[PDB]
């Protein structure tokens, strides 16, 4: 007798109706995968520093289609004649991004 199966499906359908009408948000944020919260620093993890001639320079910025120079505390470009020496003394002989600095 298919009537019993039909009526149990009606039972489960009214259960879902009751859940959806009232407990929509609870079941939505409980029984469902959800996207990770984005981090602005996650995008900047690849931001690293180098030297161009005598100017500190920034690389790794995704939205930075054209490379843009760095700025100091006074909103002015940083011009140092020993930029490469500074990088060798601080960051060593290998490039250093924000990831390893943050993980320190």
């Amino acid at each position: 007798v298919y009537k019993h199966r039909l009526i149990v499906l009606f039972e489960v359908f009214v259960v879902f109706i009751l859940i959806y009408v009232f407990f929509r948000s609870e079941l939505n944020m409980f029984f469902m995968p959800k996207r990770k919260i984005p981090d602005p620093i996650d995008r900047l993890r690849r931001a690293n520093l180098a030297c161009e001639d005598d100017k500190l320079m920034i690389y790794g910025l995704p939205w930075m289609t054209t490379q843009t120079s760095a700025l100091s505390i006074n909103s002015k470009p940083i011009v140092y004649k020993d930029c490469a020496k500074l990088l060798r003394s601080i960051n060593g002989s290998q490039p250093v991004s924000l990831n390893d600095v943050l993980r320190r």
Binding site: S25, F30, L49, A70, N74, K76, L102
Partner: protein
Amino acid sequence: ASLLYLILFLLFVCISYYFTYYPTNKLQAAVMETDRENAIIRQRNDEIPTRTLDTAIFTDASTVASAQIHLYYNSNIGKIIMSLNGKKHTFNLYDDNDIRTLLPILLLSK
């Protein structure tokens, strides 16, 4: 089929367990969800150091001095606050000028 009955009964058991032992109302469920996601958020914030950090700060275009600074990350506005010589300065992670000014200090820190 037996499989349909089994899955229907298991759906019964799961929904009944949820309604009996889990917060049915939106407020307590939101509290639990915020507890979890704020655990992750606080891990993210505490990942940023808060103690003293030695770094070479460029006071002008061709002048640099080594000094100690403090850092604190705020995710309410997604910005960073830094302390230098008892003075607090804000840098937004979205504004181009703020990130451009902040990057040399963060990347030149030992």
